[PDB]
Design a protein around this ligand. Structure first.
Ligand SMILES: *[C@@H]1O[C@H](CO)[C@@H](O[C@@H]2O[C@H](CO)[C@@H](O)[C@H](O)[C@H]2NC(C)=O)[C@H](O)[C@H]1NC(C)=O
Ligand SMILES: *[C@@H]1O[C@H](CO)[C@@H](O[C@@H]2O[C@H](CO)[C@@H](O)[C@H](O)[C@H]2NC(C)=O)[C@H](O)[C@H]1NC(C)=O
Ligand SMILES: *[C@@H]1O[C@H](CO)[C@@H](O[C@@H]2O[C@H](CO)[C@@H](O)[C@H](O)[C@H]2NC(C)=O)[C@H](O)[C@H]1NC(C)=O
Ligand SMILES: *[C@@H]1O[C@H](CO)[C@@H](O)[C@H](O)[C@H]1NC(C)=O
Ligand SMILES: *[C@@H]1O[C@H](CO)[C@@H](O)[C@H](O)[C@H]1NC(C)=O
Ligand SMILES: *[C@@H]1O[C@H](CO)[C@@H](O)[C@H](O)[C@H]1NC(C)=O
Ligand SMILES: *[C@@H]1O[C@H](CO)[C@@H](O)[C@H](O)[C@H]1NC(C)=O
Ligand SMILES: *[C@@H]1O[C@H](CO)[C@@H](O)[C@H](O)[C@H]1NC(C)=O
Ligand SMILES: *[C@@H]1O[C@H](CO)[C@@H](O)[C@H](O)[C@H]1NC(C)=O
Ligand SMILES: *[C@@H]1O[C@H](CO)[C@@H](O)[C@H](O)[C@H]1NC(C)=O
Ligand SMILES: *[C@@H]1O[C@H](CO)[C@@H](O)[C@H](O)[C@H]1NC(C)=O
Lengths: 96, 48, 193, 346, 97
């Protein structure tokens, strides 16, 4: 679960799962200012933008997905198997 | 998945250097050498 | 029927995409030309002095004409002498340039051809003012304009045409009709289908 | 010279082919949508008809009151040394002549209300290469009228030696200005002229000073238009895809109707307007006389080889001297070598 | 028999043409020793050799060129820039985007 005493909205294992897939090589998050400068005009991303090959961003961000996972884990811990059928029913974790 | 998408986009970018049977792989040295009578049979090869 | 008179060596310049003294300052043809160029040598019946523009401030647009016999302070009109007893590259040559267009308009100039009878509801190959094609002809109830000859489909396929003999509308359909399936057992068993 | 907006005006037939039930996209010269035309008045309490600019085409819409606008005079310099292509009615016929004209400073007319009719369009003509007279009209109402009644729109296009005229004529009840709406035109004239046209005027009828008239002049520009066609073969809708994002979206989606959502659009926004030319400054004329016209050319089995460098390539000096029996180029076009630069010539 | 050639070298034989002024940061169509194109010119800072006229990309697209006058280096960029999306409701509902 996320730590409320931290600036990040993701947990420790969720932070370790990030910084393991290198997304910088694909150029998913690139500005148009550095492409128009001309100093690094021989990049492999600015040619894709110059030839009309753009990459659209995903709808859901990472913070929303982290909130979804945290909600699912908290519902599993506090309620158990019964929050997927109807309303959430509290039960101690030992009895679950 | 990331490597495959990046490789596909890089291949699509790099596939612009094939002349496809025309006299050049660029549209600027075809339009600045041949007149409009016989330059239309070279641009269509590039488009197709 | 654009007509003029040039030297014999300049006939190669009357063409789409050429340069010289004819295709630059005298008479330029458009790039998308659809016509015929005819030229022949008459060095005996064309004797005199004929002029041509040697130099100009700019080139010529297609099918453009200028009769300025003197531009600024110079004539810009050189002359060559046409006669016999002269080298064949320097002899007169009549040139006639024609220009055609095939629109959806009634025809004015046609070729010699004899018209036959009209056959309907049969697979025939037709000919309507040079439009050669195959199909089944039948009478049509569609309404045309007062000038148009053939109406097109959504796939640029001519399906209706007007016969110039009797002014009426005909419909054109393919000879083959739809899909026809064959049901058979194995060949080694029988041959009935 | 006040400027009035032209809302969805000036749509004509750029192609002579017949099309029905099609959303075909053209790329030709059109009047841009919501462009600002100039307003020229003809009030008495003036008479102005300056030499306008004829570029790739002209949109001419005149709100006449009683036949004040008669016709037009085309040409290039309006001098003794260039041919004009006037289209003027004599109040009974229409004359289309392409001669060498001798026009005055103000080509006015006169009306029969003042018991004086004398066409003062031009002084004399000579060396005329085209002339035709047709009487497909009735005599105009020379007496005047107290308000504007009808508006006439005209478009002239010169291309490949062919002069095409498109016209429309609609009745309104106007007091000042130009209405808003979509107007289509139709071709009536496809004459062969053969002259080049860069400036044109308009002839107006004076009474001894006219009462009231107004005309508007626009210039066509290169643009992309999407047109709609009905079952009759006429235009019922037309959108200029260079003014609004919705127009670009309609062009990209290939439809006049769109649903609710977000779509990616193509680029019809920018267009080049000025040209840049950069060449090295070399002024030496090439030795085209000591190479071509030598004293003795060598025999074929011992042909020589000469190098050419630091030159300018001007074939024009051969135009009034020699005629080549054959001249054919491989690799480059024989018409694009005037503006080319080479690195080594033998 | 004349035999020309075109390379990435300084020119020696050229046709008659008059040079004009240089316009930057605009969508223009240029002409550099018979290399006719269309793009946006920008004062560049890349380094060439002592004889190179125009550089090339991975897709054989000319992006940097040296003008024959003043011997500077100019960068060429496309006139259209990026992807533009239009968000709209239905046409029958409204016409605001
Ligand atoms: C129509 O032809 C005339 C006559 O050649 C052109 O008038 C001159 O054209 C030259 C071409 O270099 C210009 O430098 C001059 O400024 C023009 N005007 C005068 C008064 O000499 C005219 O430009 C041509 N029109 C078009 C649209 O090409
Ligand atoms: C090449 O130059 C020669 C002279 O070396 C030219 O021949 C003569 O040119 C003069 C010029 O004043 C004329 O008056 C003569 O009639 C010419 N004589 C002959 C026999 O031609 C010649 O015209 C030039 N051009 C070519 C293509 O040979
Ligand atoms: C052919 O054209 C050339 C080029 O214009 C003419 O040569 C010019 O002649 C005049 C008059 O003698 C001189 O003032 C110029 O200096 C010449 N120009 C050049 C570039 O040499 C020539 O007279 C024309 N006619 C003939 C018969 O050759
Ligand atoms: C000639 O053409 C006219 C007009 O289309 C038509 O009525 C007539 O049948 C044709 N044939 C003969 C033999 O007159
Ligand atoms: C309106 O006229 C002005 C000049 O006053 C001009 O710059 C502009 O392009 C015209 N059109 C629009 C849509 O503003
Ligand atoms: C124009 O040409 C005519 C030809 O008849 C001549 O009479 C007239 O004097 C000329 N006008 C000039 C040069 O101003
Ligand atoms: C009609 O034009 C002719 C010249 O073709 C002229 O002589 C005549 O006067 C004109 N008619 C009228 C009524 O002005
Ligand atoms: C037409 O031009 C020619 C050539 O200059 C001249 O001889 C002739 O007199 C002109 N025609 C008229 C009617 O002036
Ligand atoms: C076509 O135009 C005619 C008039 O020529 C009119 O009666 C008819 O309604 C129009 N048809 C359509 C489908 O627009
Ligand atoms: C949009 O849709 C309506 C309903 O289908 C259709 O009739 C109409 O022609 C369209 N609107 C236009 C082309 O402006
Ligand atoms: C001529 O070329 C030189 C050398 O490239 C350049 O410096 C100069 O600006 C050019 N123009 C003039 C007018 O000297």
């Amino acid at each position: 679960l996320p730590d409320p005493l931290k600036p990040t909205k993701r947990s420790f294992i969720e932070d370790l799962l990030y910084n393991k897939v290198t997304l910088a090589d694909a150029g998913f998050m690139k500005q148009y200012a550095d492409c128009l400068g001309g100093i690094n005009a021989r990049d492999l991303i600015c040619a894709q933008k110059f030839n009309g090959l753009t990459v659209l961003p995903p709808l859901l961000t990472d913070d929303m997905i982290a909130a979804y996972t945290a909600a699912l884990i908290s519902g599993t811990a506090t309620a158990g198997w019964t929050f997927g059928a109807g309303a959430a029913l509290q039960i101690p974790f030992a009895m679950q | 998945v990331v490597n495959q998408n990046a490789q596909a986009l890089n291949t699509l970018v790099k596939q612009l250097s094939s002349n496809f049977g025309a006299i050049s792989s660029a549209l600027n040295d075809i339009l600045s050498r041949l007149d409009k009578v016989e330059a239309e049979v070279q641009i269509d090869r590039l488009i197709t | 029927a654009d007509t003029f008179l040039i030297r014999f060596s300049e006939v190669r310049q009357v063409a789409p995409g050429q340069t010289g003294v004819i295709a630059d300052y005298n008479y330029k043809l458009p790039d998308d030309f659809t016509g015929c160029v005819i030229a022949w040598n008459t060095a005996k019946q064309d004797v005199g002095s004929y002029f041509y523009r040697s130099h100009r401030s700019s080139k010529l647009k297609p099918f453009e004409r200028d009769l300025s016999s003197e531009e600024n302070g110079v004539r810009t009109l050189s002359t060559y002498d046409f006669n016999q007893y002269v080298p064949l590259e320097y002899q007169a040559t009549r040139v006639v340039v024609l220009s055609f267009e095939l629109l959806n308009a009634p025809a004015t100039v046609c070729g010699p051809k004899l018209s036959t009878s009209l056959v309907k509801n049969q697979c025939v190959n037709f000919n309507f003012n040079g439009f050669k094609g195959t199909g089944v002809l039948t009478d049509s109830s569609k309404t045309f304009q007062s000038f148009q000859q053939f109406g097109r489909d959504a796939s640029d396929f001519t399906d209706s045409v007007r016969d110039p003999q009797t002014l009426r509308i005909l419909d054109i359909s393919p000879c083959s009709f739809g899909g026809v399936s064959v049901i058979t057992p194995g060949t080694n068993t029988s041959s009935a289908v | 010279l006040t400027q009035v907006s032209s809302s969805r005006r000036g749509v004509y037939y750029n192609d002579d082919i017949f099309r029905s039930d099609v959303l075909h996209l053209t790329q030709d010269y059109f009047l841009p949508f919501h462009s600002n035309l100039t307003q020229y008045f003809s009030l008495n309490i003036y008479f102005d008809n300056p030499i306008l600019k004829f570029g790739d085409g002209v949109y001419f819409a005149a709100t006449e009151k009683s036949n004040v606008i008669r016709g037009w005079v085309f040409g290039s310099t309006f001098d003794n040394t260039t041919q004009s292509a006037i289209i003027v009615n004599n109040s009974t016929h229409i004359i289309i002549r392409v001669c060498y004209f001798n026009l005055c400073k103000d080509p006015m007319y006169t009306v029969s209300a003042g018991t004086q009719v004398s066409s003062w369009v031009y002084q004399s003509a000579f060396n005329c290469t085209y002339d035709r007279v047709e009487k497909s009209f009735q005599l105009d109402t020379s007496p005047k009228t107290g308000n504007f009644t009808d508006l006439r729109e005209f478009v002239f296009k010169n291309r490949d030696g062919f002069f095409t005229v498109y016209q429309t004529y609609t009745p309104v009840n106007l007091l000042r200005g130009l209405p808003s709406g979509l107007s289509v035109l139709k071709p009536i004239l496809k004459l062969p002229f053969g002259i080049n046209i860069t400036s044109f005027r308009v002839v107006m009828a004076m009474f001894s000073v006219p009462e009231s008239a107004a005309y508007y002049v626009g210039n066509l520009k290169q643009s992309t238009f999407m047109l709609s066609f009905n079952q009759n073969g006429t235009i019922v809708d037309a959108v200029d895809c260079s003014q609004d994002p919705l127009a670009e979206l309609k062009c990209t989606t290939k439809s006049f109707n769109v649903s609710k959502g977000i779509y990616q659009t193509s680029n019809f926004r920018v267009s080049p307007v000025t040209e840049v030319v950069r060449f090295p400054n070399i002024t030496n004329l090439c030795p085209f006389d000591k190479v071509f016209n030598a004293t003795r050319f060598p025999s074929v089995y011992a042909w020589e080889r000469t190098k050419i460098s630091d030159c300018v390539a001007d074939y024009t000096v051969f135009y009034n001297s020699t005629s080549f029996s054959t001249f054919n180029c491989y690799g480059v076009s024989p018409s694009k070598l005037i503006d080319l630069c080479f690195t080594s010539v033998y």
